[PDB]
Coordinates of C-alpha atoms in Angstrom, one line a residue:
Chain X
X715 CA 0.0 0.0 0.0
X716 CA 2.4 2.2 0.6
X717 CA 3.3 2.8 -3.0
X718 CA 1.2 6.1 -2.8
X719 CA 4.2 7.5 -0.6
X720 CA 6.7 6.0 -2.4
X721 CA 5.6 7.8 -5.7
X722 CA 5.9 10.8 -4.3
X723 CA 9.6 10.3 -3.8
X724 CA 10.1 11.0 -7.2
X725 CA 9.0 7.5 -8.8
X726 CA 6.0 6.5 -11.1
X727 CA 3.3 4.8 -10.8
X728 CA 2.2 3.2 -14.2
X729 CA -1.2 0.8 -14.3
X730 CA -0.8 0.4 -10.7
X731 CA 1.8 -1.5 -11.2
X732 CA 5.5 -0.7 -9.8
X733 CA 8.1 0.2 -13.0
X734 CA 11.7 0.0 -13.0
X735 CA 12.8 2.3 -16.0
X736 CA 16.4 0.9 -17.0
X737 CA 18.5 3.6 -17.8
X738 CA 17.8 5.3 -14.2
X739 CA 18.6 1.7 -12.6
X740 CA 21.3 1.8 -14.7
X741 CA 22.6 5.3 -13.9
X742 CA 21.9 4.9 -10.0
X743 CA 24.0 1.6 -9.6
X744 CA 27.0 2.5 -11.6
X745 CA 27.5 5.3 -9.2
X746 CA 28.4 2.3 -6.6
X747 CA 30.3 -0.1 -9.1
X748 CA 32.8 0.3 -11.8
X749 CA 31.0 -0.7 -15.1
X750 CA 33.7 -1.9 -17.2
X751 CA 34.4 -4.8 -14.7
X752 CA 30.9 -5.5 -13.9
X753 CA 29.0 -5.0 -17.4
X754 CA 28.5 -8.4 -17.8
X755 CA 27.3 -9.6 -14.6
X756 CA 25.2 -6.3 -14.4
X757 CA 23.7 -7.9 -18.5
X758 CA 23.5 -11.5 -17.5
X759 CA 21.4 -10.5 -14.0
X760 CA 19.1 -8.8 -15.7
X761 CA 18.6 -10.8 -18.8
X762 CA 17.7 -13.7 -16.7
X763 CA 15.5 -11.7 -13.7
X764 CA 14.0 -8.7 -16.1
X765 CA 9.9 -9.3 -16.8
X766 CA 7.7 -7.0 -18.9
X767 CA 4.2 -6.2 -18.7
X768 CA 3.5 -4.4 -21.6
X769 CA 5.9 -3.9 -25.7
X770 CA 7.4 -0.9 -23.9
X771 CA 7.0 -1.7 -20.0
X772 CA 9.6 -3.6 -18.6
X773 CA 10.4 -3.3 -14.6
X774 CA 11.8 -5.4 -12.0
X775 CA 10.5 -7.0 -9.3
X776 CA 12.6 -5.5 -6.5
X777 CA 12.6 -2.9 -4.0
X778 CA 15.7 -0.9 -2.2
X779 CA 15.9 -0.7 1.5
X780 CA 17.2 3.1 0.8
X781 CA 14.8 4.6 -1.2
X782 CA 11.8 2.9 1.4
X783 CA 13.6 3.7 5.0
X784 CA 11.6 6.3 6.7
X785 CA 14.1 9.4 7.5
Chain J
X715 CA 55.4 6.1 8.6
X716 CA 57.1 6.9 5.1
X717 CA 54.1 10.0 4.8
X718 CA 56.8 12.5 5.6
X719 CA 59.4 12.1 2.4
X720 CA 56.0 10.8 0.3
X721 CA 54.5 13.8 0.6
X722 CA 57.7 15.5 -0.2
X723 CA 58.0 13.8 -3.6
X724 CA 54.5 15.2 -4.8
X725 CA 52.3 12.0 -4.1
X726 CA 49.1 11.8 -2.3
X727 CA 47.6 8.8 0.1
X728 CA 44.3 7.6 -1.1
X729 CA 42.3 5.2 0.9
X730 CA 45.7 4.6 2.7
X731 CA 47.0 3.3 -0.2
X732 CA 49.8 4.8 -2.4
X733 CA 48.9 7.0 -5.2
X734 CA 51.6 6.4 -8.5
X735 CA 50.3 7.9 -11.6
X736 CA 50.4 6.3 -15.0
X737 CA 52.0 8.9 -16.9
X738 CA 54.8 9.4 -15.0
X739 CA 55.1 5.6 -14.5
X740 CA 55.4 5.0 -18.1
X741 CA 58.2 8.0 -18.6
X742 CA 60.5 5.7 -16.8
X743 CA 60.1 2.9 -18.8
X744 CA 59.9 4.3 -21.9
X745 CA 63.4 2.1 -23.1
X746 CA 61.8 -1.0 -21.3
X747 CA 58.8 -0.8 -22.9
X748 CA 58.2 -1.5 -26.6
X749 CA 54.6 -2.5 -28.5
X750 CA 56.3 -4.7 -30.8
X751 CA 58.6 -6.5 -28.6
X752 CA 57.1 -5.6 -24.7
X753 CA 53.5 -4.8 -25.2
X754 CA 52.0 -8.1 -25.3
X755 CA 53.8 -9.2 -21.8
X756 CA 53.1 -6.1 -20.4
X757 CA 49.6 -6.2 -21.1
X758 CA 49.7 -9.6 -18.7
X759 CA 51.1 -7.5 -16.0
X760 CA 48.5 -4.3 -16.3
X761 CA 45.5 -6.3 -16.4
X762 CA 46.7 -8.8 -13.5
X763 CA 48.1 -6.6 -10.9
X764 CA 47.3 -2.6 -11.9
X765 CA 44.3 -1.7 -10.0
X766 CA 41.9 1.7 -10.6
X767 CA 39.4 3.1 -8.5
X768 CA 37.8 4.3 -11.5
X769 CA 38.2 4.7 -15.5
X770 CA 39.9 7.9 -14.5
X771 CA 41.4 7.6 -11.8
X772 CA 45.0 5.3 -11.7
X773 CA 47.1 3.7 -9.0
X774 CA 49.3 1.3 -8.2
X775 CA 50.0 -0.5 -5.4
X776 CA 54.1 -0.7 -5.2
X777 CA 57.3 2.2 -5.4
X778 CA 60.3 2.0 -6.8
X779 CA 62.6 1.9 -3.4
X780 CA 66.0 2.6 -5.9
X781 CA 64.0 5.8 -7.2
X782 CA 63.4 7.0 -3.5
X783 CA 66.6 7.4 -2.4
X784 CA 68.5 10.6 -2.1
X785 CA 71.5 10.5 -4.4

């Protein structure tokens, strides 16, 4: 339920359903990692965990503890 | 305990971890390094034991003890 919250932390909400847009995952954890040595694990995770809803809707199925921890 | 003739020489301690930069490194061994004859075992030696905190940023973890020394 809390999703209503959570959109207002700068996220969106598309057909109730929770969206992970790639390049913003993308952009967020390579802030963390160094992307030449970790391209192909970041490719092969996400090949093998990524689902779609829609042609054009693709999100993930998990949650941060960061972006969800009450300040 | 070596801080006070490191900083002396110009280098900095990142992470507590000495700070030797590539260009400099490869001015040295400029006669000992050669693409037709040296490049293919150096390349062995960059990629195994040169480490980078980033694609910018570049370090490695020994000094030259003979180049230290006060003549």
């Amino acid at each position: 339920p809390l999703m209503t919250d959570l959109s207002k932390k700068g996220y969106i909400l598309y057909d109730n359903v929770v969206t992970l847009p790639l390049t913003t995952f993308q952009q967020k954890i390579s802030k963390y990692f160094n992307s030449r040595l970790f391209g192909h694990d970041i490719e092969s995770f996400i090949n093998r965990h990524k689902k779609f809803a829609n042609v054009s809707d693709e999100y993930l199925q998990y949650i941060f503890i960061e972006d969800i921890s009450s300040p």
